Amino acid sequence: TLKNKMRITLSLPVGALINCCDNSGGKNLYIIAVQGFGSCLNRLPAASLGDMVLATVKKGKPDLRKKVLNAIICRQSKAWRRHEGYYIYFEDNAGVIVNPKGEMKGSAITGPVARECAELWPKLSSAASAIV
């Protein structure tokens, strides 16, 4: 699978709390790290709508709690530019729990998923309902 992902505006820094968007049992997610982030003195790591993150679950069924997990961002509230020449934004921020290799722990996504996110992960595209 190719990994190109033309740049997207980042607005979801570390310490944000977002919805969980799937049927795995959790209700929210708490971002604590972002893969691929480098070094810069006072800067916070931040993620956009195709990246994989490390998160914990603050509410949901007890066996999912008190652990570090993997997640993938599917919707975001900050606007971003599409090369066709317009701007897009959702209402809320959502993500799903996955494997370190990007395989879901649940079996269904609830709401719409972004068209850029589905181009990078084939299982998420297969399990989606409406791609926008």
Partner 1 sequence: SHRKFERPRHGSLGFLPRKRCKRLRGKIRSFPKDDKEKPPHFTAFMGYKAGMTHIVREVDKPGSKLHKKEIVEACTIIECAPMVVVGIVGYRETPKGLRILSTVWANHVSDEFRRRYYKNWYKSEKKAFTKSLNVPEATKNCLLKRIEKYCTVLRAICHTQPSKTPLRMKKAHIMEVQINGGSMKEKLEFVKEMLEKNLPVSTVFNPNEMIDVISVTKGHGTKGVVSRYGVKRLPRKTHRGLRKVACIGAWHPARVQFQIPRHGQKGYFHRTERNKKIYRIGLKTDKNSASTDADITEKKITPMGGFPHYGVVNEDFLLLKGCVAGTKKRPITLRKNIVPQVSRDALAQVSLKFIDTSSKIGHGRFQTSEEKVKYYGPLK
Partner 2 sequence: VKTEACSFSEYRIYPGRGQKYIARDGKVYFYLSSKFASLALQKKKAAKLRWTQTWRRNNKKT
Q: Report which residue type is found at 61.
A: K
Mask for 3-32, x = binds partner 2 (CB under 8 A): ------------------------------
Annotated binding residue at 4? no
Q: Is 37 in the site for RNA (CB under 7 A)?
A: yes
- The neighbouring-strand residues paired with 60 are 26
Q: Is 132 in the site for partner 2 (CB under 8 A)?
A: yes
Q: Is 90 in the site for RNA (CB under 7 A)?
A: no
**How many C-beta atoms surround the C-beta of residue 30 within 10 A?**
17
Q: Is 83 in the site for partner 1 (CB under 8 A)?
A: yes
- Category of 60 on φ-ψ map: left (φ > 0), alpha (ψ -120 to 50) or beta: left
| Annotation: binding site for Mg(2+) | 42
